A paper describes a structure:
A novel cytoplasmic dye-decolorizing peroxidase from [name] was investigated that oxidizes anthraquinone dyes, lignin model compounds, and general peroxidase substrates such as ABTS efficiently. Dictyostelium [name] is a dimer, with each monomer exhibiting a two-domain, α/β ferredoxin-like fold. In solution, Dictyostelium [name] exists as a stable dimer with the side chain of Asp146 contributing to the stabilization of the dimer interface by extending the hydrogen bond network connecting two monomers. The active site of Dictyostelium [name] has a hexa-coordinated heme iron with a histidine residue at the proximal axial position and either an activated oxygen or CN− molecule at the distal axial position.
Since earlier studies have shown that peroxidase–CN− complexes are a good and stable mimic of the peroxidase-H2O2 bound state, we recorded the UV-Vis spectra of Dictyostelium [name] at pH 8.0 in the presence of KCN. The absorption spectrum suggests that the binding of CN− leads to a change in the electronic state of iron from high spin to low spin. To understand the binding mode of H2O2, we crystallized and solved the structure of Dictyostelium [name]-CN− to 1.85 Å. The asymmetric unit contains two copies of the complex. Though the binding mode of H2O2 and cyanide differ, the position of the carbon atom still mimics the position of the iron-coordinated oxygen of H2O2 during the formation of compound I. Therefore, the position of the cyanide can provide information about possible interactions between Asp149 and the iron-coordinated oxygen of H2O2. Superposition of the Dictyostelium [name]:O2 and the cyanide complex structures shows a minor change in Cα-RMSD of 0.13 Å. The cyanide molecule takes the place of the O2 molecule in the [name]:O2 complex structure. No changes in the conformation of active site residues are observed. This is different from the situation reported for the BadDyP-CN− complex, where a change in the location of the aspartate side chain was reported. Our O2 complex structure, as well as the CN− complex structure, shows the Asp149 in hydrogen bonding distance to the proximal oxygen of H2O2, suggesting that Asp149 can accept a proton from H2O2 and compound I can form without side-chain movement.
Author numbering:
A (entry chain B), B (entry chain A): 1 to 306
Amino acid sequence: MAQSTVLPMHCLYGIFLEGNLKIQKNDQEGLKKFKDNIKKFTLELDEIDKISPQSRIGGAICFSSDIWDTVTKKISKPKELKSVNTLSSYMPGTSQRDILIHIISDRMDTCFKLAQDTMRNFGEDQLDIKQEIHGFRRVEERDLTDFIDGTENPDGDELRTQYGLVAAGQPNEFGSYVFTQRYVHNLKKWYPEPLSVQQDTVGRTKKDSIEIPRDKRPITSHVSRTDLSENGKDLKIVRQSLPYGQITGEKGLMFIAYACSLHNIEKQLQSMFGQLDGKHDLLLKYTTPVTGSFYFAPSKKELLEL
Amino acid sequence: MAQSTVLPMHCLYGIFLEGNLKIQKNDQEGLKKFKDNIKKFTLELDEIDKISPQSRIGGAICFSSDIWDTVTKKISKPKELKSVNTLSSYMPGTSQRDILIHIISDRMDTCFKLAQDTMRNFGEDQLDIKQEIHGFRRVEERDLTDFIDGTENPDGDELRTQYGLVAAGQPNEFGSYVFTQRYVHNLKKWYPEPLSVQQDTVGRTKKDSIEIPRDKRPITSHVSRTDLSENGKDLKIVRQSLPYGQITGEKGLMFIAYACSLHNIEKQLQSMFGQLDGKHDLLLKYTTPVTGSFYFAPSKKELLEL
Ligand code: HEM
Ligand code: HEM
Ligand SMILES: [C-]#N
Ligand SMILES: [C-]#N
C-alpha cells in the first residue's frame, strides 16, 4: 500500500531527481499527461520487479506543500507538510523543490533504466530538474567519514512501518514525510583528525560502530544530537542515505529520511543546528548541507488518485 | 601474466582515473615511493579478488610515452608508443596525460574501494588527476544510442590474448597498448532519427545487433569504418568501454581499447576521422570526443620491475 522506498533495507544504489513542475495550475491537459506519466512510473516499477527480482527495485514520487494544490484537488494536504525554506534562518542550504523521484536498486543498470525511462516520459517540458545524484553503497556500508552508517536505523517491516509511514486510519495513511539534504564532506579536514576526535564527533567507535557510553561522549556528538525522545516516545526515522561523488572531487552524503510525522525529522534538525539548546552537531565542523527539501510520498492508492 | 583488465569480459562497473605525475625525473626518493604505491595497488587487487570473488575485480596502471623515461631506466619503451596529441590535426579532444588507472568490477563498492584506496596511497603529492569517470553497464549492454555494444569484441582468453596483448617473445610481451577517449552524446539529435537511419549509422540492426551486409550499408557506417584488415589479417582490438553520465546532463561513452599493437587502434581512428578517404564516421554526427590519451599497460612483471 505504500510506495516502495521506505520498507526495504540495504539498497546498493539510489538515484535522486529533484526539481520543479513546469505545468500551470489551470493547464488541465498538461496535468492529465503528468498524471499518466506517474502511472507509467508505477507500471514500469512493477515490470522491472518481475523481470529483475535480484534488483530489489523500489521507487517513490514525492510532492512539496507548495505544489500540492497544483497536482490535486481530491487528496487533502498532509497536516504537517510545509516548505523547508522556513528553516533557512538557522539551517543552511535550503532549496525547496516541487518534486522528488527516488529510485533504489541492488543494480545500477536497472536503477538507471527506470530513472532514464521516467525522465524521458515526463520530459523537459514537464520537469525542470535541479539536481540529479547517483548514490552508491560503499564496502561495509560506511559513509565517506568511514564510519558505518545505519547501525540504529529501524530494522524490519514492522518497525519501519511504525516509524516510516503514516498510521492506518489517519488521513493520508501509508504515505510518508520525506526530507532530502545533500552534504559535501571536507575530508581534507576530517582525515587528519585523531581517532578520539572522530569518535567523539560521531558518538560510536569507528571500527565496529559500538556506542560510546553517554557519559563519555559529548552532548554535541552526532548520535547525542539525533537520538531524541518526547513523552517517552523515541523520535525515530527511516534513513535511506547513500554516499555519492568523486574520489578526486566533490563528494559527501546524499541524506534522505522517511517518517510517519515530519516533526520527528524537524526536531532532529533543530537539535543538530542549534535551535534546541544553542549547540550544534560536531559533525557540522566537517561537512556542509548544500541542498534541502521537504516532501510527502503518498500511499500508492493516493498517488494514483491525485 | 598480464594486468587484469584485458582478458575479462562483461564488467558491470569501471572507474577511469587519468592525470599527470608530479614527481621529477631527479627525485629518486619520490620515485621509490611511487613504485611502492604501484606495488600496493597490485597487492590490494589480489586481496580483493580473494575476499570478493563475485566482484571479478581487475585493474591496470598504464603509462604514456612522455612519462616513460621518468618512471623507468630499466624497461625499454614500447616500440609504437607515442602521444595522442600528434593526432590533434584531425581528431578533436586530444588531451594526453601521463598516467591511467583503470579498475573494473561487477560491484561498485569494490571498484570504488580499490580506486579510493589507490588514490589515497599515491596522494595529491604524486598524482594530479585530470579526469575521473564512473562507468556503468546498462541493461542488455547497450550504449546510450541504445545499440548493443560489444557484439564483435574478441571473445575468450585465446582471442583476447592474441589481439589485446603483445605477443610472447616480443619486447614488452604481455603488455598492452591502451587508448582512452571520452565521448559526449547528443541524444536529442539521435532519438528523432528513424530506425533505418540509426541502423545505417551503426551498420547493425538495433534490436538484435545483426550485421547489415557490407554492400547494403554506407561505407561511413561505424562498422564499415572500424572493421578493417591488412594483408588478410584483421585489425582487431579489445574494447572495455562503458556508458557514463547524468540523465539530465552530460552523458556518453567512456571509450577504452586494449591492443597488441597501437597500429590496430590508430588505423581505425584515421578511418573514423576522415584521414583515409576524406569521409567521417556517421556516428560522429551524434557524438563528440572531448578527451583522448595513448598509454601502455606493462605486463605484471615489467610493472613491478620499473
Ligand atoms: C553528513 C551527514 C551525516 C552523516 C555522515 C551521518 C552519519 C551517521 C552515522 C555514522 C550514524 C551512526 C550509525 C547509525 O546508527 O546509523 C548516524 C546515526 C544517525 N543519524 Fe546521521 N549522519 C548525517 C546526517 C544526519 C541528519 C541530517 C539526520 C537527521 C535529519 C541524521 C539522523 C541520524 C539518526 C536518527 C541516527 C541514529 C541515532 C540513534 O538513535 O542512535 N543524520 N548518522
Ligand atoms: C561514441 C563512440 C562509440 C560508440 C557509441 C560505438 C558503438 C559501437 C557499436 C554499437 C558497435 C557494434 C557492436 C559491436 O560489435 O561491438 C561498435 C563496434 C565497434 N566499434 Fe565502436 N563505438 C564507438 C567508438 C569507437 C571507437 C573510437 C573505436 C576505435 C578506436 C571503435 C571501434 C569499434 C570496433 C572495432 C567495433 C567492431 C567492428 C567489427 O569488427 O565489426 N568504436 N561500436
Ligand atoms: C545518516 N544517514
Ligand atoms: C565501442 N566501444
